[PDB]
Design a protein around this ligand. Structure first.
Ligand SMILES: NC(=O)[C@H]1CCCN(C(=O)Cc2cccnc2C(F)(F)F)C1
Ligand SMILES: [Zn+2]
Length: 139
């Protein structure tokens, strides 16, 4: 679990979106595993606007933050899950590192801010759904 709170937006993994998220839906993209909903209170997180390929992510299955080198956002084949069939997920960044399903939502950050959130993993890899191209979160 985990979310990003910026302005009047709540960014969560689409497969973990709640009834409240869907009733206050702003945008969703199943190929990115992202959903944004509207909130009453203002959020205090800052989205990174950069091409950083190093950062730190929160790993709930380890109660630890880990430093990682990650790939640029691209179309990567994501294995069939209980939430989605086999498919290419776009705007996904891979890193060598630990993850388990309950880790989705953990934030990946650089000096510039929130880079994205854990969305895929397995076999010693962790995939993050990028949020840096979504400039409308700033306004
Ligand atoms: N974006 C996706 O298709 C998600 C759908 C449901 C969640 N999901 C996974 O369970 C992938 C997975 C399997 C084994 C270890 N770690 C992970 C993960 F949690 F992502 F880190 C992929
Ligand atoms: Zn950065």
């Amino acid at each position: 679990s985990g979310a990003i709170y910026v302005g009047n937006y709540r960014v969560v993994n689409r497969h973990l979106a709640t009834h409240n998220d869907w009733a206050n839906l702003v945008w969703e993209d199943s190929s990115r595993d992202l959903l944004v909903s509207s909130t009453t209170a203002q959020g205090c997180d800052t989205i990174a606007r950069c091409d950083c390929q190093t950062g730190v992510y929160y790993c709930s299955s380890r109660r630890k933050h880990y430093p990682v080198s990650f790939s640029k956002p691209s179309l990567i084949f994501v294995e069939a899950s209980e939430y989605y069939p086999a498919r290419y997920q776009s705007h996904l960044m891979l890193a060598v590192g630990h993850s388990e399903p309950g880790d989705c939502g953990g934030i990946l950050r650089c000096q510039h801010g929130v880079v994205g959130i854990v969305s895929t993993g397995g076999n010693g890899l962790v995939g993050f759904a990028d949020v840096r191209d979504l400039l409308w979160l700033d306004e």
